Each structure stands twice: as structure tokens, then as C-alpha cells.
Amino acid sequence: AVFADLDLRAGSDLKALRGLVETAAHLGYSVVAINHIVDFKEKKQEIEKPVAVSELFTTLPIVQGKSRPIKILTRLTIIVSDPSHCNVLRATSSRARLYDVVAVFPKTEKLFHIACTHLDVDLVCITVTEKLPFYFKRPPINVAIDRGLAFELVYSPAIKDSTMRRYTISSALNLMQICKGKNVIISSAAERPLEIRGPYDVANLGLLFGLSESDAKAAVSTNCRAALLHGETRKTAFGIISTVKKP
Amino acid sequence: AVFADLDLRAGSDLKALRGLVETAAHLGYSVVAINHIVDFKEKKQEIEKPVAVSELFTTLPIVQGKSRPIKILTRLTIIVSDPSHCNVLRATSSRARLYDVVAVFPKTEKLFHIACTHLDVDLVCITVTEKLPFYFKRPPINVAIDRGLAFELVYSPAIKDSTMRRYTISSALNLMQICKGKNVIISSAAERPLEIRGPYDVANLGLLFGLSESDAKAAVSTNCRAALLHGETRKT
Amino acid sequence: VRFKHRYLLCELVSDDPRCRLSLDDRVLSSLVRDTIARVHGTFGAAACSIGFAVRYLNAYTGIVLLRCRKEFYQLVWSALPFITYLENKGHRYPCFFNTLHVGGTIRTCQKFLIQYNRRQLLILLQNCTDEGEREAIQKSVTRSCLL
Amino acid sequence: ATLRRLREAPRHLLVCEKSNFGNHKSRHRHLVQTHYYNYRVSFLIPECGILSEELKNLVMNTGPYYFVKNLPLHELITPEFISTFIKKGSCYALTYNTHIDEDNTVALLPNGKLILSLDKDTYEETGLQGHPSQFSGRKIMKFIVSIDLMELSLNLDSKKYERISWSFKEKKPLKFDFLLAWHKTGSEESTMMSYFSKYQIQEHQPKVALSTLRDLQCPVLQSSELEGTPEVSCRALELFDWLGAVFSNVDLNNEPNNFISTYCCPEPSTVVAKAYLCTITGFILPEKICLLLEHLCHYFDEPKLAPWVTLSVQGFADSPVSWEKNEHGFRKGGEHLYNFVIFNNQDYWLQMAVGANDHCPP
Amino acid sequence: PAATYERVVYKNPSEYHYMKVCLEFQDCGVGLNAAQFKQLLISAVKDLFGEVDAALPLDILTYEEKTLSAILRICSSGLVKLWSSLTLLGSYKGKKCAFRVIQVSPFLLALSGNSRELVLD
RNA sequence: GCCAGCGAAGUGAGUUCAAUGGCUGAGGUGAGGUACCCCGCAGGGGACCUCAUAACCCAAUUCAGACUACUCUCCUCCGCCCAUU
């Protein structure tokens, strides 16, 4: 029953980051998750100290609700088109062990097949910009919903154009018609310093997609916590949690 | 369950009349009723021989479906704004007993009240063009649906403008939400020689107006025969 | 593993057979998308970008068979009457009219098209009374009886 | 499928009743006393400018209440707190600004039942026996644990009491911001400022808002007709919507312009020169609402100009249990409210407004 | 004299929905007007969802200038479409406006008292 | 181990560019509340309102049996823990 969990694609500078954190803490949010877009052309890996939130923010974000300390997550969104770049991401399962939730973005149907079949990821990114048609096979979706794969739908087409709005709503209606709507969570991107709307109306932005009259909000509020759970069971251990506790 | 019964507002000349009759018979119609727009400014009454369909048409209109003879009705749409013009229409209840369906068009809420309360009419015309706001009181609508008053909605904004489309769809949604949707029939006017729509399309166009997924088609196919029966009982 | 498709027939009713000769798949698709974009927004028109597509077209006959989804055929068939003002090389006014709505099932849709074509042939015969068309009617009846 | 989801419903329940004050079967006093948590108590009188002092002294003395920051739950189960506040009066307690579908929410009943609605994590970490209450289809969202303190006060050496004490003290220490009140029904006086002196207790008075509105178009009612007679009386539900429109500081005529505002007043009606409006906002005790309802009943003893007065009470939109057994959920909104339309012949109307997912009592 | 008891229970008689929204304009160029807000509400639903769905029966209540707050009502048909139209951020001139909804009710009393904060200290 | 086909009408649904579990209301069952009615063993029976009636999945010739995927639902054998006499 953990609400207020979305995925943000936002890094420009510290000032815009502080503004987005203050805006999210003001409106309705209690967990901020920052994505980092990495494409297949650059192939860069800077994982050790790239962001450093706690050394630069001031000790607490204050919200209007229960006034609880906001947990801040650092996630990685990897755009993967080539199959060799997917093999590079296969090589990163033992070399560098950070970035609690690993989010792959597929473009090839064979690569999307082996992503749901063999490749150990947390949440598959599905965004459609500038004419990307894609078919859906149902038994890997069944293995995905049996495993725990929550499908990410990162949306921000309303700010730039309207054709991008059309392709996103068409791909989302196709996803809701084929995937049947078991675990699909939607999230907003942040390039401009104000690209966030109300938290209760994200439920209707998912209800325009479909998925239920109420289990859209119930499914995002359950499956984002289940996504943090899946990332934690990938990070710590698959059945064990070992934490150093020195009182 | 008599299908293909709608109303038209079309008279310019005999050639356009023959063209619209052939178009309606070819596409989707089995009863054609011609309205005659009379405003409150002119106040003219020409009832005896204005139209003369049977003396000028050729013996039958033939349809592409069941191939049945089309009954042709001559209706009168009277635009009434002044209360004295409504008293003139009150004076015509015994003078000239023709024009089987009498269709009043009200503009005053008191006049619409006495139209549904005391005035003997068959089908009240409700069209909204160029900013006409209008409220509705529920007990005269209840007396109207208990009596048999079918509400006409004549629409043709689809070719001229888009603001007229906005005002017609707003008036239609207000009528469907207030009147509860018991007996409302929608029809098309024909000024241009191509201002007609599909026969099955009336169901989905009333679905865009609302009222049900099905009761648009059910209400037109029942209430047109009910309105013809009401006009027949008013005439006899 | 499948999706229940819906189909719809529409007749273009107009004179001046340059309008009958002015038909194309891309032009009709862009026309229907542009006239839905005026009526419906992104949610209505973009569902027609994935679901709606041109399927069967005849130039001279004017019968168009189109596809549409389960949750969107009401929106498509409500968007069909608002197809107005096709601007082209001439000043034309074409207009669609629905014959009958067939719930998918292409085979009986082609069956109903044959009876509709026979009704369009046989009813036009008595009102014209001309032998030059009647000879082609007799040839068409003979070729249909050879089938 | 999706088009029906665009326009299906939010759920609505609106129940209207009519009753007498001099009737022995009237359970309005039980319905006010057994309703616990209250936020906004407003009353409306047509054709009255100057308020009497007897009602003004009742309005200015509806509180007070107390606010304690970070109070642990194991303070609420001590025998001193039971024998001091629970056994000697009506003690009311509720957590502050914790959502019922999102966070943990604890409430205390005057019968002695501490009822706490928890999520799955807190219900597993405390280890108390409860029941599955709020679902998500096949998954379970929120549990409710009820602990009757009056039965445990008779046997303080039982295993249940030490189990709950070990669960609250050492197993999972839960702290919340508590709103507190105590209706005194005891000869031994002991204030709450001296008991909770270790934590930052703050005493607060309810906010009083007074309004005198001019030219208000009030509908005409009949006492013996709920549905309303045609062209004589109006409907009580349209009067409730107009009541909400007046309390939104909105009262205008038809305005034909670009920003079109069509609003039908319930007709036939009567113009009222002065409308007195009072709104009390805070942690309202139900006994003060009982004295207010008795004073509004006895207001029509003298010949007055008001035909009917209005008393509307909106409760807390973040409470676990309201209307004596019913669960207050939050499906994109929804509240619970009760109204009184008091006539001059001791007849009243009992309205009940229900939000999205909540059961309605008789 | 009349004194009796009667139980009447209704199912969905509400038929209306109200929205209190506080406006958060980004730039300092606040050239607001009562008619221009209505024109923006018409032009947003037209391009976003439809011109037929733009002329839904809607109106504005307590339009406040400096406080930047208003109430919008639509009946029970297009409330979802109004929420999504105000979600997808339809603009006016090129200065992109953030439209953030405070509260929605089917009642003008529970919306008018308080629902969001329920105490502000 | 091997050895036996019928091109002609149209499945208590029979489609194949691949239709058929759509809406409303009362009763069934699992539950809650009662200011309703009848009978006199503290009570019993009927009456009124609301919530829940899902998931797995989809037929192309049928049937029998076995399999795997079920949980609104019913008949039993049970285990552990909590509380009482």
C-alpha cells in the first residue's frame, strides 16, 4: 500500500533537480526515482559517483502529508538496439554491481523475446516515438507476469507535439488490448523544470489507457512497490537480505 | 416497428424536389414528410393547393429495398416568437383543418409552457441557431410525455459552420440530460441538394447525442408511428 | 491469440463520374484520418492509425469495405457521416452512405454484396426502358447464370 | 469496453428521511452521539440578522481539543490512561494526516475499542490479530485490528494484555500525531495538559466563521412531502446542491456571455433579505452538536420568521470507522455527511450523503 | 398537523460533478480573463479529444483572479474526459501552463469546506 | 510386422482476411444493519437497502480417457499457532 512512486528522467543541473524535488514533495510524491538515459551509440559506464544526492541536498525534503523521509532511488534506463549491446549488458551482471533497478529498453523483437525469456532485468522500458511499430507475443508476457516484470510506460508527449501524443496513445491502447493489463506502470519525464501534474490524475491518465476504473491506481501503487521489491531481491540476494546493523 | 420515417425541410423548385425524393427513395427512406417554414414576420396562410405532389410526380417512388409505395406527408413548421402569433395559431384550430401534423417552434419559456400545457400541437420543434439558451421545467415535460409529444431535433450544421455544430451538440446534450430521453426524434433539413445522411446512421448519430446505445433507433422507429397515430387521432 | 475484427460497407453517392474516377487508397486514408482528426482528437484518430485501414475499394461501383476494432467501431461509424468537403482537382461534393453493418465475417459480407448488386440491377430496369442497356443486362444475367 | 470505462459511474448513495422530535422512535440523538469524528458544523437561518447570546455562547465554546506530536501507542494502553480518561469520561483520539488507503491510521472509541487500520507491513510487524478489510481484488491492502481495552482492564495480568504491551513497546514502537479530546463525566478532575506534559501538547479552539448574506433565493418546502409536490414545493436534494452552492460563496443570476453559466434555482422560491451563516471548523465533539440540535429544535418555540433552518455536518474524510460500523474509503475522493432541515412544527429531515466506497446506515 | 416516518433510498441521483482547481501559471505574464479561460477549455478538448466532446455542458464557479482558483462542473458523462483534457496540458499562445487539480467532488459542500489538508497549521 | 476409403449439400454455436459470454431490474449464495409486518419461549419466520458473484481461457469435425492452468463454490481427512472451561 505504498503510493507516490514514479520514475523520472531528469538531470540537467543541481538547481532544476532541487526544483523538481521541491515540486514533487509539494504536490503528492514521497519516493523520487531518477532515470539515466544511456544509448547504444555512446556506451559509457560512469557508475561510482555520478549524482551524489545526499551530499548536495539539505538533509530532508518536506511534504504536506505525513512528513516522512523520502527515499531517493538512482535508476538506469539503457536504450538497447543492437544485439551485441545486449551482450554488453549481459556482461554487466557481475562486473559493476550498483544501480538497484536496471531498466532495459528493447527495439528488436528477438531481443525483446530474450529479454523476457533469459535476460535478467527488472523493468522493461516501452516508449514509442517517431513511428515505432511492434508486435506482442503472449507466452513471454505470461512468463513476465509470472516472474514479476512490470512494464514501464514513460510518457511525456503532451509538451512537444501532438503526433507524439498520437503514437503514444496508439501504442498504449495496443498494450492494453494485447497485454490484458496485469502489471503496467506509467511514469513522467522531466526536461523542463515543471513537467509534472497531480498524482491522483495519473490514475486517470492510466484509465484513458484503460486497465480498470480503479485497478489502474491500485496496480501502479502495488506494482511500483513490487518493482522496488524485485530490484531489492536482485540487489541484496534472491531469497536473503543481509544488512549491517550496528546500534 | 415501422422503419425509415424522418422529416425534411425542403422546397425550392420541382427539380430539386424530384432529386431529393429520388435520393431519399434510393438510400434509406419509405415515408417522406416535407416541412414548410413559416415565421412570425410574414404571417401568411396558404393551405389549399401549395405543393401538389401527386399531380406532378410520376405515379411512384421506388426504393432499393422492400419496394413499397412511399406515403408522402405535408407538414407545417411555424416559427412562433410573439404571444399574439401563438393566439393566431390558437385561432386556426377550427378554421382550416388540414396539415395533419402541426409543428410549433417556441422561443419564449412561457410560450413553451403553454404549448405543453394547453396548446394542441403534435411535435414541438427545438432547434438552436446563433446563441439561443433555453431552460426546461420537468412537470410540463412529464405531461408532454404522458400526452404523446415527440420532440423534434432538426439538424444540418455539418456543411455550413462548426460553431453551429457546437450549439446544436450542446442543445442536444442538454436535452438528453434534462428531458431524460423518452420521445425525441432527430431529422435533417435539405437546403442544398446533398444534405441527407444514412438510414442506419441515425442510430449512431443519436448515440453521439446519447440516450442509449440502442434507444435512439428504437425511439425513432416507435415514436414516428406514435406521432402519426397522434396526428390521426387529432384529425379524427 | 486473435482479435474480433469488424467491417463496414459505405457507398459513395454522387453524380459527375470524374468523382467516380477519383479514388485512391492513400488519398482516402488521409481523407478519413483528417476528417476524424477534426471530429475526434488524438484518442479517436490514433486508434484509427493502428486499427482502421483500407481493405476493399472499387472505382466505378463506389462500394468501400473498411476495417475497425471491437472497442472503436462505434466511434468510427459515428465519425463516418461527418466526411464532408473533399477538395480535389475539381469542385466535387462526394458523400458516404451506409448499406448494412456486418459484424466481421468477410464471406457473408461478400454474400450480401451480391444480393445488393442484384437489387441494384433489377430495380433500375423498368423505369429506364431502353434496349441499349438491356442488352448488357441480358449479357450480365447470362454470365451470372454461367457461374 | 474502454468507452464504458470513460463514463460508467462513481458510486453515489443519498438517503433522505423525515421524522418528529416529539416521537419516541426518533433515534437522532443516538445517531449524533454514536457518530464520533467531525470536521465542519455549519448552520443557516433565513431572515435573522442578530444572533442571540445563548447560541453565541454555545458556538464560542464547542472545543477545545489537543494536538500531540509523536505520541507512542503504548501510552494509550497504560492502566492510568484507562482509569483516568476512559473510565471517567469519553476519550476521543485520532491520528493526523495519515491516509486510510496509504498510511497507518489509529482511532480510539468511547466504548473502549482502539481500532487501528494498518497496511500489510505494519500488520505483519506488530503481530496483532485482526481481519482482512480493504482489498485490491485478489490482493489485500489494509487490515483492521480492534483491541477492547475495557475487557483487558478487568484482567491486567492476562496473556492478551502483556502480548499487546510487548507488541507496542519492544516489538514495533509506533508514533503518530494525535488529535485528542475528553468529555468529562467524572467527579475527579484531571486535565490533559498535566498528563501529556512530556510531549509537545497544544490546546486549540475551533475556528468560527460568521457570514451575513443578502438577497438569497430560498426554496419553499412542505414538511409532509419528501419528493416535492409539482409547482408548490421543491426537492430536498436540489436544495442540498443549492446549499452547497451558497456555502461556496456563489449566488448569481443567469449570465449570457462567452463564459456561459447555466444554473437553475429550485423554483418556486422566496427572496430572503438576510441569511445568517455560521461555520465551526475543528475537532468537534458530538455532545456539542447534540446541544446545538436541541437549541435549534427549541428555537421554534417563539414565533420566528424562519420557516426552516439548516444544520450540516461534514466529518473527517480520513477516518477508519464512521457511522458506527462503516468503513470510509478513498476512491479518488468521496466523503460522508449528514444534514438537518428543521421546520417549525418539530419536524426534521435526516439526510445522509455517502462517497464512493462506503456502506450506509439506517 | 402532520407527523410520520418514511424511508427513501436513491441510486445515483447526483448527475453533476464539480472540480476546485488552483491555477499555477509558469511565467509572470498573467493576462487572465473569464472568457479566455472558457475559450481555452473549449480549444483544449477540441484538439485533444473532440469538438463534439468540447461542447459538453460545463460552467465556471467562483472565478478568482489573484487567488488563481476556480470550480468547473460537468455532468457524469465527460468527467473522465475533462480530467484527461486538463491533464494533457493544452496551451493558449506558447507560454505553457501547468494545470494542477486541487480537488474533485460530486458535492458542492464537501469540496467547499475542506477535503485535501483537513487542518492547516 | 504387414494388409482396408468414401469429390455433391449444409455440427441441439459451425466461423475460416477467422461472428457468438452486450445493458438494465428482481430473486440464488456469501455478509452487514433495521424506526417494517405476523405469531407470544427469552424469541422465531417473512419484508427493505448496500457490497461480492471472479480467474483460467478462448471451439473450426465429434467423442472417451489421461494432463496441465483455477477459485465466487460445495463433501470430507488434517496440521500449526492464539484465547477459554
**8 A C-beta contact, residue B144 and residue B126:** no
Q: Look at strands B102-106 and B76-80 and give their pairing.
A: parallel
Q: State the alpha helices, DSSP H only, in E1-121.
A: 34-48, 79-87, 110-113
Cis peptide before A247 (omega within 30 of 0): no
Alpha-carbon distances, residue D345 vs B109, D81, D159, D300, D301 (angstroms): 37, 45, 57, 8, 9
What DSSP state is assigned to residue C81?
G
Q: Would you tell me how many other CB atoms lie within 10 Å of the CB of residue B203?
A: 23
Mutate: best of E11, E74, E108, E120, partner D, most D CBs <10 A:
E108
CATH T-level assignment (fold) for domain B5-235: TIM Barrel (3.20.20)
* Protein residue ranges contacting nucleic strand F, Cβ under 7 Å: A 138, 142, 180; B 214; C 1-2, 4-5, 7, 55, 103-108; D 4, 11, 13, 17, 19, 23, 25-28, 129, 137-138, 158-160, 163, 325, 350, 359-362; E 5, 7, 9, 11
Q: Resolution of the coordinates in A?
A: 3.9
CA atoms of D200 and C63, how far apart (whole Å): 81
Cβ-Cβ pairs closer than 8 A, D with E, add up to 148
How many domains would you assign to chain C?
1
CA atoms of E104 and D332, how far apart (whole Å): 8
CA atoms of B101 and B122, how far apart (whole Å): 6
Q: Which of A211, A207, A213, A156 is nearest to A183 (CA)?
A: A211
CA atoms of A31 and A21, how far apart (whole Å): 10
Place of cell 459480407: C109
Residue C51's domain comprises 1-147
Place of cell 549491517: A244
In strand F, which positions have an atom below 7 A from any protein CB? 15-20, 22-23, 25, 32-36, 48-51, 54, 56-59, 72, 82-84
What DSSP state is assigned to residue A71?
E
CA atoms of B89 and B76, how far apart (whole Å): 12
Q: Helix, strand or coil for residue B91? A: helix
Residues of D (211-230) whose Cβ lies below 8 Å from B: 230
C65/F21 CA-to-C1' distance in Å:
28
What DSSP state is assigned to residue A205?
H
CA atoms of B126 and B136, how far apart (whole Å): 12
- Tell me the nt nearest to D8, Cα to C1': F23
CA atoms of E1 and D350, how far apart (whole Å): 19
Cβ neighbors of D313 (< 8 A, separation 6 or more) are D38, D40, D41, D42, D284, D289, D337, D338, D339
- Tell me the nt nearest to D30, Cα to C1': F35
Residues in chain C closer than 8 A to A162 (CB atoms): 42
Q: What is the CA radius of gyration of chain C?
A: 17
CA atoms of A155 and D320, how far apart (whole Å): 35
Phi-psi region of D244 (alpha: psi -120 to 50; beta: other; left: phi over 0): alpha
Q: CB-based contact (8 Å) between B178 and chain E?
A: no
Helices first, then strands: H and E counts in chain A = 7, 8
Alpha-carbon distances, residue B56 vs B13, B32, B48, B60, C124 (angstroms): 12, 16, 16, 11, 21
Length, in residues, of chain A: 247
**8 A C-beta contact, residue D153 and residue D80:** no
How would you class E44 by CB atoms within 10 Å of its CB: exposed for 0-12, middle for 13-18, buried for 19 or more? buried
CA atoms of A22 and D322, how far apart (whole Å): 35
Q: CB-based contact (8 Å) between E26 and chain A?
A: yes
**8 A C-beta contact, residue D289 and residue D280:** no
**8 A C-beta contact, residue D18 and residue D347:** yes
- Tell me the nt nearest to D354, Cα to C1': F50
Three state DSSP letters for chain D? CHHHHCCCCCCCEEEEEEEECCCCCCCHHHHHHCCCCCCEEEEEEECCCCCCHHHHHHHCCCCCEEEEEEEEHHHCCCHHHHHHHHCCEEEEEEECCCCCCCCCEEEECCCCEEEEEECHHHHHHHCCCCEEEEECCCCEEEEEEEEEHHHHHHCCCCHHHHHHHHHHHHHCCCEEEEEEEEEECCCCCCCHHHHCCCCCEEEECCEEEEEEEEEEEEECCCCCCCCCCCCCCCCHHHHHHHHHHHCCCCCCCCECCCCCECCCCCCCEEEEEEEEEEEEECCCCHHHHHHHHHHHHHHHHCCCCCCCEEEEEECCCCCCEECCCEECCCCCCCCCEEEEEECCCCEEEEEEEECCCCCCCC
CA atoms of A113 and A106, how far apart (whole Å): 9
* Concatenated DSSP letters of B197-223: --TTHHHHHHHHH-S-SSHHHHHHHHH
**8 A C-beta contact, residue D217 and residue D89:** no
Q: What is the CA radius of gyration of chain D?
A: 23
- Tell me the nt nearest to C6, Cα to C1': F19
- Which cell numbers hold the place of E23? 491555477
- Across the interface, do B174 and E57 touch by the CB < 8 Å criterion? yes
Q: Helix, strand or coil for residue E64? A: strand
Domains and their CATH numbers in chain E: 16-105 (3.30.70.3250)
| Facing residue for C120 by CB, picked from B64, B207, B213 | B64
- What letter represents residue D168's amino acid? F
State residue B167 phi and psi, 5-degree precision: -70, -35
Angle (CA) D117 D120 D125, round 5° = 95
**8 A C-beta contact, residue A42 and residue A3:** no
State residue E11 phi and psi, 5-degree precision: -125, 115
CA atoms of C48 and C67, how far apart (whole Å): 9
B92/F42 CA-to-C1' distance in Å:
79
User: Looking at CA atoms only, how far is residue B161 from chain D in angstroms?
Assistant: 18
Place of cell 466511434: C75
Q: Would you tell me how many other CB atoms lie within 10 Å of the CB of residue B110?
A: 10
